[model samples]
Target chain A: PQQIDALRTLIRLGSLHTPMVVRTAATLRLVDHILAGARTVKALAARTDTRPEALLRLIRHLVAIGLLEEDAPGEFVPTEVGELLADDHPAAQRAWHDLTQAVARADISFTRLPDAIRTGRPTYESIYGKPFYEDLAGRPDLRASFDSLLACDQDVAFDAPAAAYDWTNVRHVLDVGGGKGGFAAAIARRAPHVSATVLEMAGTVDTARSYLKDEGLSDRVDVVEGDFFEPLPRKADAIILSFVLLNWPDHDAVRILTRCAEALEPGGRILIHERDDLHENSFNEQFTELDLRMLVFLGGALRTREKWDGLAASAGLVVEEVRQLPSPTIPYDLSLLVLAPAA
Target chain B: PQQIDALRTLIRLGSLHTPMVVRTAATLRLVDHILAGARTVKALAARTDTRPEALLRLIRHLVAIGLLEEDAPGEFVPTEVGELLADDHPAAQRAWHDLTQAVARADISFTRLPDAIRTGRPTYESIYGKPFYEDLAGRPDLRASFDSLLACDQDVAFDAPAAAYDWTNVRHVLDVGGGKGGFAAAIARRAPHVSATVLEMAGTVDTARSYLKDEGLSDRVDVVEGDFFEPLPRKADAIILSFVLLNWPDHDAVRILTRCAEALEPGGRILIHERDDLHENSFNEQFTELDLRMLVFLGGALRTREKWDGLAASAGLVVEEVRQLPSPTIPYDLSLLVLAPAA
Candidate 1:
């Protein structure tokens, strides 16, 4: 086959089964141990509490795909491609494994995606019969796992807050919704003189504080247990909203920006860093899909730059300048929106 | 952006949300009418029974992905890409929509795909606590839909059967498990001098006879409803087993072949047209995955060439050859295995 034909065939065949089969394999954690070495069907069945004959068929199927190799007749080993699924492998593909399964399990939530396309409101609440975020709030562990996934992706957004503004002038910065304090610690590390205050829900404050303590920055960083919707006691020269705006409806986002504006000092800047606005050729188109995931799983929207501008203008603030930053995966433009008191 | 980069970005972005959002648009048939110049969110929502606000957000997301164009504030139109989902489009994207939504529905038996992978067993039993074939026997509407899907794909098989085989010399041909007498009608049309018997289950005999009558072949093809496992009504020159061997395990397959051999003349041939045996290659690799799907959904196995040959040899038949046929899809390799009583 020609290279293009081969590529297309690979894609068509891969798409036909990979997502479905890989998800099944991940949900079953088949490759996690299979990659260590070959195991007989009976042994594998015993370990997983499955039937040998049936599992043999599955092994045969996997071996057919080159993920699991048949060493001899009944035993199997993982090929190089299969090694990626090992929990402790160099890449630690479990996180990606969990990510795909999470989406698959939430498959029904996405069924309502079309409802959103038609209604501009989420079909999640109607279908699932509950608010997505409220449900997440009850499951702290899963919520933490979900946040860790968010943190893994947060490192990229941290770059925008680093590059688009001068951090040296600020003595104190408050990171709102800094769940694990990774972002705040990064900022504090760059500006040694500046102390960081992280304002999150009371339930999540301990997590942020403990992470900062583990990083040996607890002395310099204070975890303030508060909601951004209400007033905060902590005063800071800069209020940093990183990857937060996309998780709210426009009205709520406007209110949140208003609160941030009221909280900033005279020379202080409300530094807004998000995935990007999905406006005329802006990156937010990608962000909007992420917003749908939120709608299905959490009910949120990714705002465009124009929406941000309108919110800022409504909140008695002037836009200092908008700076762009490069991103690798997010389809949306990542921007650092600087805001100060109206001149 | 450069064209290559744009395409790559689109591919990556598109994939990230395909199972998540695009499927949602498909599930709701949102693109069907909206792409046809439905501009107002309110109107689209009313027609689709969705809330306007949520529909607007989804439209914005689609706009971001270049599927729909936001012609003006609060108004939208479809892009060239969105035309693929039109109701009459050849791709039958609507079938895909209906299928995905059905799969996502609460009654979906595929939800146990994980268990199916682990146990190498069909989850149909667990989902409905009944055999799929048995349930189909009782539900005529569902069975009719299934038969349509099966026979629609078998057009090539139907056409090639009459032309490829030298039926003029044969005295009697048994169309075992022939649904609605399609293959029987084809054979009767080609071999007017030869008599044909359409062997099917007792429950399907009426439908088969009716279809044969509609095709005007009822007078020629005898509709004998009987199980293939039992002894044949009488010895015949040849036994035609079309698309039957795939449903059984190797042991059962051998037993069935033995029965066919016992009922065949000394030098009579047994023509077997089934999904090809998984020869050792990537194409065969895809066949194994198909085997897994069969295991999960249909409780069937797609055997390898070695397995099929071994079964035929044990049944006192000589495997003459396996001939590959033209495939509608690249991943599929349809074939015919011609066997005969050993001299």
Candidate 2:
């Protein structure tokens, strides 16, 4: 009975656009305006340029959900829960939830999820007439949004992976598909002896160039414009495919792995850091979210630990070592794997 | 700190397409086939005409989220949570969540929620080029999917309001905008002395006709074909705006109430029943879901107690009493109000 009851709760919760509504609230600067004394719906509406009636309805739901509260007659205040939506909250989520941003733009494609499952194709490419990366490549506006998120997450996401393994013996480290060379920059900054190179697409090569120069790692890190699918220009002593391998099918996944294996020098190791997010024993379903995201936007899926071993072995590569890279800023669960050529 | 953490959890939970995914699972008949021994991803995909790889990712999420469980190396089974999603479950939720169904079809417009908030116009009408009811009217296939849900909820939704008030003095009850005459049928079945009439739009009049006949209550319940915004023909001693007022703005809602008042005979009592679903003190955000549904599909909002008083008074009517109608079959919290001629 409780199972059925919880199912009912999930459906009720799932049927909601609260998250998006919360996003809308943040976009309209509701919490910001409320704190700044634009408490009335009419005042808030005037400030946001939204209709008073519609905005009134929106506020009612906001208050209904406990994000905003009515302290007195016609007086509104942001709850502590609502305050987290402020743009300056230390754990700020405004951009992450904003509809105008690329993350939520990708979420819009999920509206076509039925079509995706039926045709076994990604919906973003179908809707926008190009794949996820290509679409982002065409729209600098969209890429800016993507970059906004990356500055917060992708910048800090490499800390654990960079420090997880020792680079004492390694000379040149290659970071595959590393946009903005965040991981390469991390390694260059931490291990002074290990010079690094970043492999990125034509659309993002300059970004890595600019970011690496700004970080004062231009002398230490080299940016190479290339595609992971085509070929690697040069072999390095160590290679890192950070958060890159999860965006392809088994054939392409193996193809990339084989290429990475071939790109490594003798006795060299390739670091395979991926979002191995089973989200097991957890209440939050972000991993399932990541899977759907890959399914909808990129035609990829997050592999489980069981599949990782099989995937590596399929490419004639054996998993030599595995480590859990801890996230300090965010609760990201990326697992690092060191793969070597099979005997 | 915990507020932000809970906010994060809510965001993660809200960001999920689990509800729609569950609907897809039900549509694909995942549970039925799983229980029937088609447990392998390949078998399930071939059965459902989906790709095995995509289906595998989906199943992994279902398991990741605890809907399905892996009991053996390769075998899968539905957990208690999964069982409730089955088509034949006692509280079947398949149709409610099915993508092909009208309810979910309306939810698609929620992707354009920002537009709804901006222009104060419903998105469904904009997306489908017609209002929700009009779209349902044109598509019998969609209507079938809609009726599939109405059979469960709307049929039983009237029981509480039907028996909430004594009808000894009220000879005739007029049900305004009453689709399928479910409320009228409810009134006739339990209150043997009361004959009821249903006022509905052209598209829904036949449905009410068919349903009243099916219930063998055609003799007691009459179906009137007309638009509520237009003149309501004739008058009655008792009237009902059950679940109908919540779908319009204050002006339109008061317009509806005034018309109901004008259509009432002397000393007649009108029942203003609505989904007074604040959903406060609850984890489920279904009321927010309902508010967004109305905003997206109908340009309406659910009024709270503070607004209801003004809404009733705006129609130049006085509230005599209020009663909480207990939903025996569902956890619906509809409040019934008795409106009388203002002294």
Candidate 3:
């Protein structure tokens, strides 16, 4: 038990190294390269435009850590765990790895976590001379990495909201703050009769249009480029705020919900989807982590059910029903709240 | 299985945030204060000189991650793992956490790990204009934290080199590159009849002297400030190179070993204490991780037994015997090689 406990602590302390290692592998597309039969370090180095000896050491470590397998001297093969690193894998984690790596490389403002705690705000501006989002906006590459990382679970997470709610009577749906139109596309694909609109920021509108086109939902789903806090596109019978509200504090969350409520027709419903627990279970661990991430990066939080209720009430909406949408792949339980206009 | 695999990947990718949280806790001395019964965030903030709301978010995340427990709303208690973070705990990891935090805060050089591999040199200088050691030397706080981190295992690691080999006939023992004279002091205490001399860099000599004096071994052990690559103090009956060589390249390692051999008496032997194997086991994982750390931070490595033998032979020394000294707390199996001068 002591050993296990010691190991758990070691793992926690040593975790900073993991993102770098994973990033290195992802940068070189090592998993994909290995899958393509470039098993030797020399071959991988030549293909990845890296030095052979350094690549050798890197691959050896990957093998030692169970990501790559060294079947023979200087030869590396991917393990089942390593397959998830391949860019084309259905559950590929390359984007997440890249996102973490980018954040790690940005600055050590996190070292000022105490300052952040003491100030009730991120110390990013104090250290980097700019807020985290502003910095990301300046660095398009980092912004793109983050956007992709946020959409990493699109395939599974998007389907959850679509399948959990009734769309029979919903002739039109609006995806408020949806990045890249993944959720709207999923809903449109699931309900061929309903047309959808994705309201996102200007920077992501073109990308969302392209994504919808690629998903074959461009004909039914339209992309509207504007901040949801600014007046949202109106006349949707049903609106979905899937996995978006957690990015803002209570005031902003209420403001975003109010915008959505105003955009919906009378007697129409709104589906609010998010994780709502802070327990220590494996599922809630992700949400809690995101909560901290939001604190440090977004000045937001993963609100509890009570907090959500107050926000919805502030937005003049009443919760009519609630449904739990559990994805087979993700750990956290997703909740869908059906809301109507308050009397 | 896929879900578990996916979650595992998510956890691994998400791990970069762990060290920062732990470091924040360590920096604020939250665990120590919590152990002292400052259980509420408000109390912790008052005691730690941090913001209450900010600290509340931090402690909440800590509770979510199982380091701290929420006995009541806003009230926190240390878990078993959290107890190890207390500065006074017997096996406290506070030093390690602080050391990691210091390194993590120093530069973004780790983001250039690929460049390090390609060049076979650390990229720390590229980002910080100096090597990691030089930077540490300039920052007394960082250097002290690093020194303390190295000595964290002094209780167990120091005893291994002292007890693994029979020091019955050892009159004068030389510790080449010994930091703060911990190993030499251990030997001086274990074998009361023997006088031990620790040769370290000038920067660490005073600290080592102070440490040995504090250990009440000032009279029995001497701290000599000099480079180990140069001729070491001569005529020692036994020499110990504990946890030193791995911080250097092959040429430097051989040169250091050569200096140790040159300092030995006619029948004296050099004890080479280091971790040898790079297995896939947990102990080796730490070694492997350290190996990578050395590669990226110092441009050094963890040498294998065959590599060690070659380096020792390059210094005109032959391996006499190798003894395994396993630590109860640490995972790596320590090896003590008895090396005699080649005829």
Candidate 4:
């Protein structure tokens, strides 16, 4: 049974398209209405704009495997597990489903992994003759999908730094390269005295402002439009670099950290919340898999704690402390690092 | 637990490329040889002409699923379950796998289920711009592969009649529309006095002869190249129609049966073995699904008992008996009708 269960896991991961099948099942949005509570195949197919017979066959196949229950001869309903794939429940992850769809399409590019591994260059550039970011920047919808996907993961991204260290000393804060203002919003929500400004690319700033406005915090947050490499807004008490450092190469990471250091006030602290390389949790494994995704999609990496600390120190910031944040998804040992000027 | 199991099952089945995944996996031939003795990933990859790393990943996935065991890390051997998919194994039926691949590729063209159900007309002509036979006549390899595929299911096809029927009295036998002489060879091997002639298309005769010679029964089996709707050769003591009627509509089935009747000797029997329609058996439910597949690929119907009985009676033959073959995969009941001259 151990081996049988293990084989199931193997097929699920190896197909890589299993996630695609899950998303397609989710895309039909069958569970929500079916469980809560449509019954007939005709009705379900009518609602979904699908063929009744074909849908019946698909549903029967699903039922045979158990995603759905054949409650009666022609009637169908979602099993509790199928409910998780539905659109609007607490565990509903339609956005993650959409992300997997995007990833599966992106995985096709990784078919050239042999070429990439051999030459130590992106196989994507070999195939398309341009970098992934350049291609994505041209495709607005895919870029938007990717941005939204990043936003979905932002909750876990923020949990690490937001939960670690005391925010009592922090007054005014700036979130550098904060997309959608999630990190800033999170900190602002936690530290009442911390009025926050989110400095991001102009395009991301527009999205950040909208997200902030939607959260009814239009009054508390400022969306600053600027590139971090050039200059950041000066004189912030605390700087939170969350998830931004991982998007570039080692040199660029150092450059960005130096820029953050140059922008901080004396005696001010820089809170760097990033994925630690030593973390060997499932999420870390998941993130490593996702890192390959960034390599192909955005040319990103998940740096280790040493690499991140080294990059920050070279930028003239002193390492203060590293604390693990409490997260269901993240590992226990690797969390946010608090950096300050050396005594 | 049931729901979770179902989700896992749906995930498993969905993860399986249905036809394409099975074909690719079957093409890899991981189950048979790997399970038998081969343990090295490099050796397996070398034999299959695949990259070692890619093969390793595929094998590891199967190992994780329990279909195979990795006795040592990075080395794989198939488990008992994996042995079922081995090509030369007794239980191996890659036909369903290959058939589905053909359907998925739109080679058989089943995407028109909506039009067929609504219009009550055949979808194949509309989708493929030709009847299935016309399409088959254009591609000999496809026709030949299909013939082999049908022959693979011959055990199921002959399960009832082959065991129950008395072959001692039979002399000369005619295999109507026997593409490559498989059924004829089976009969010829069993009954020495029964010289068999396989009636097939002109293009298929050479293949039938070659296949029969390879079976070492070329002297006993004659390949007659002709369309079945035309008048057949005369005076065979027994006429065998195996798996042919399912591809045609009722009208064509009757027409072919009528021609078979014209070629029969006085008091001769016409044997019909086929995949029977949905009845009490769950296999019928699976067969019903095959209807859509038939519609897509062969422009055929999975005939009901009534349809078969009616067609036989109309063709100048009387129904003797309908026997159900106990099938494990779909519990597919094979109906064997001994049709003789009307009383």
Candidate 5:
């Protein structure tokens, strides 16, 4: 029982220490260096641009937590968990770690959470004198980290949307609010006959084009910079709103959905991918935590299934079906909803 | 492997959200209020001095994490894990939660950790214009929370020191830097034949006196106001430094230890209680975490066994034995060292 109490307390407080060490490790690319056979503290320090003594203390803590192991005196090696810290791992979590570390910095706003709750508005603007997104836009490094975190597991996230629906009959797909064109590129790559267009803001258009080009889908997937609240490409037979609606309140979400519905041809399907609920999974608490994070960062909420139905109805759309897709790398399973314009 | 990676990412990031919510719950005494039968949001909010809507959102998170459960639509009750959040529970961690919440605020210093590591000095001074303790001394509320967290489970911490030695042969025991006389009162209560003296700063002497008086041990345990850097009472045959020396650098720790050595009678014993190393325990990570905390907050370090022996030798003392004691409420097991004047 004492151990359990201690563990619970550690769970509640580990962020104060864990994120800093993890961030430092990630930022310094300690795992990458170690993977390249930088075994001694001297070698690690030289590569990481850190002092040997301080780096030793940091590595000792990592070894204590099973992130790194010291098989011999002064020689460090990575464990399985340590491998995940690498930026190039197949299921790399470096960007997510970086994103969470930045959020932890913005957590200073959480000191005003009680007020945020009372007003049902984010206290982020009050603390920083600007909304969260504007503040993020000013910090290029943080914004890039956030964008990469969303785009990191492109294959896993895009796989569900590409396979969950029948894409053979679909000619063109519109990715509303798609940044970096990852989902759009994936769709184009998966279905050679179909063309994809990614609608994003003006600033990210170049980056999205570069990403699609890198994926060898530049010829098929068009990266268009435009506001989703305004007009969209009107030729798409299908539209995808993957992980976008949760960033806005009901009114804005309805508006985005309405615009997407208007752009689709008659009987064109709108595919949506989002988290529905905990559903008693091992990562349920994580979903709950992320929900509150949305409240603080975006003044948004993770809508329930019923809430999604209501939003679709407000857009004059009817849900054809809601299919649960496997999410191997995220806490909650992804839901793929098929929707069409109401008669 | 993907699921494991997701879980690890969640574990690393969970602290960002979990600690704040737990702290808010502790600060609002939500668990205590719920235990008092205020199960509904309206009832709980009124008692906790929070708005119902905001409090409901907070409670919803608790339910999502399985801390509290919603038996009916709006009524909430505690689960097994939730019960630990109660301040009155035997293994209560409310103070720990509050202390960690406070640390999370000071974690802003960690953004400059690389600087601290490079200079081998705390960046806390650079960020706050003062050292950690000075800053803490200026904040009474934070200081009180930290003090309470250390002194929360007094019986457990004190019992080990009181019974580890042959108190039957000792006439008087001096507790150096004893905060609020909890340990002193406990020792006096356990060893009726031995009177106790607690040496604290002038500011905390009255508090120690009041606390000892509340325990009805004021007559046997005396609260003396003086700096441990100066002379201590020369009337004790045994001296105890329960969780004190680790807060200072080696020079200051040596100075304090020298003062204790000078105050001891011939054949007098000095007892020290502190945490030492990982030792491959389940709580190894927590110990390592606390070590980095000392560096960030105090420019201090947790000494290993060899390090302690060296410090003892520098203070003209020798360690006779090191005894491990049960520490159920805290992360790691407590170490009790019996020391004697060097020949």
Candidate 6:
């Protein structure tokens, strides 16, 4: 009976401590250090910029969680789970653990959540002295973290949007708000004949170039420094607004869609790759987390399928087909919406 | 395959969002509002002073968690788990869900934990400009919240410490650092012939008086406002230190123990009701959580059985019997140590 009580408390504590530990590890690159042969607490502390004793305690707790192991008197090693723990965890799954990124980092502002809702804008702007975009503009380090997170999904077992779309006939795809050109890179890798134009702002221009260079798609993908609010810089057979409009309000989302509509060539379509089932009977936590993230970080909001259709209609476009991606990872329920100009 | 993946993601999200949602509900009194017939999102928003849409989204998230339910169109109610959720949750178990209290609230400063361990002091003092104790001293509202949390554990099904020791021969007991006299009141309930002197400080003297009067324990208990660093004013057959020594550093722990040793009449014992098995191979998260709380708040430390023995020795005292409390709730592994003056 006592053991059962202990277990209940353990699970309860996990709800709080596990995420914190995961975030700490991700931010401090704890797993990375251990893999690099800094196994002892003192060495890890010196490497991670933390106190040795406190780090020891944190490692002990991690050992208790089966994420780590104390193999020697003073030395510790990671177990299977611990080794899988990482920053920019491209090898396993998306890097949701890093609280420094957009999704996970937005939770830091949740302490002032009521104020966000009351003020009808992001609470982060109030606490941090700048809007989320402004902060990103000024801090390249934060931008790199976000770039890594966005790229993390590229290394997942499958690229769902790449599979869902018919890229055979399409010659060129324009990617709006393509941070680090991750989506463009995925599309380029998926389709041999496809070349992409990744439209990005000034802040993410260097990041986009770096991602394109790293992916070996620098020849096929062109990083264009431009604002999505302005007119299109290039016309394409098809345009992609992948996971882009979710970060903007309804008006901005409509405007972005209209710009994509204008950028599309004759008989061209706009491929929308983001969530459209959040309002359905099912509710996923990842969806909800991103929802709050968007709300708190930028007053952004996720749309249901109906809302997507409404936005498309407002942008003088009509939804042609809606296809759910096949073989999506757990908690990854994304859909692809194809839109054509309304006659 | 996809379903399993979804479950995994749900569990992962729970590690971060569950604690946050719980904290939000506790702080906003969301559950309380639902119980009070503020069922509509607009009504809850008006009541809680939050935006209607944001509050609606939070309620929807709660519904998904099975803590609350949408019984009718736009009207929500708490489920079995939801009704159990409370602010000063005394009817069930400890009020740990309240993040505003000492144990749970201390986690808010964990974002800056590395700095704390680096400075060998509380990071909270740096962030809030007040050490934990000073914050409590200046704010009666916070003190009241702490008092409620401490009082929650008293309502658990079993009083193991009261059942373990022999109180028949003891004439009187002095409860040092006994805020609100919960431990002293429990002793009075178990031993009719025994009376108690609750030695509190200036800040909690008023709080201690209220607890005594509420328990109808004023007749049998004496409340004294004094510091344990100074001489303990009242002498008794036994001195009870219930979870008190854990808040002080080693030097202060030794001083407090010495003061307790001096206050005991000849042949009288000092009863220690705390954890002594923390350093063993086994680890409990609750123990670790409090360990960090004390460290980050006041540079406090939790000692093991051997360390406790050393502290007693340093205070010119010797520990006698070591008995583990039987029928401890899950995660509630506490022990009782009897200490007397060294020969």
Clashes of each: 16, 0, 1, 8, 0, 3
DockQ score for model 4: 0.11
The global C-alpha lDDT for each of the candidates, from Candidate 1 onward, is 0.64, 0.77, 0.74, 0.62, 0.73, 0.74
Tell me the lDDT of model 5 at B65: 63
Best by TM-score: 2
lDDT of 1 by residue, A1-343 (tens): 2233432332232132334454455555677656544278777777667766666666665565556677776677766655555665533344544434333444445545555554455554674456655545665665565566556644445755575668878988888777777778878777788888888764467677777788799988888877789875666789888777777777777788778877776689988777545466542445655666666655566666677667777777777888887754433456788888776
DockQ values per model: 0.29, 0.43, 0.42, 0.11, 0.32, 0.34
Alpha carbon lDDT at A284, candidate 3: 41
Interface Cα RMSD for all candidates? 7.5, 3.5, 3.6, 8.0, 4.1, 4.3
lDDT tens per residue, model 5, A1-343: 4448544643544245555666667667778888888999899888877767667767777776667887786688977777777877755555445534446546556656666666666777886678876776676666665666678767546876777778888898899988778888777777889988998865567778888777778889888877888888666899999888877877888989988888887668888888765333312565666667777767677776766678889999988888988765544566888888887
Candidate 2 C-alpha lDDT tens digits along B151-197: 56556777877788888888899999777888888889888989899
Look at candidate 5 and give me any clashing residue pairs. none
Clashes of 5: 0
Per-model TM-score, in order, reads 0.77, 0.91, 0.86, 0.65, 0.84, 0.87
Weakest 10 consecutive residues of candidate 3 chain A by summed lDDT: A276-285
Evaluation by lDDT, superior candidate among 3 and 4: 3
Give the per-residue lDDT digits (tens) of candidate 6, residues B4-58. Answer: 5433532453256566666667667788887888999889989988877677666
Superior candidate under TM-score, 1 versus 4: 1
| Segments of candidate 2 deviating more than 4 angstroms | A1-4, A35-43, A70-81, A90-92, A153-156, A277-286, B1-8, B36-43, B89-92, B151-156, B277-286
lDDT of 1 by residue, B213-320 (tens): 777777788788787889977677778787777766667678778878888875678888777655454234456555655676666677677777777778888788
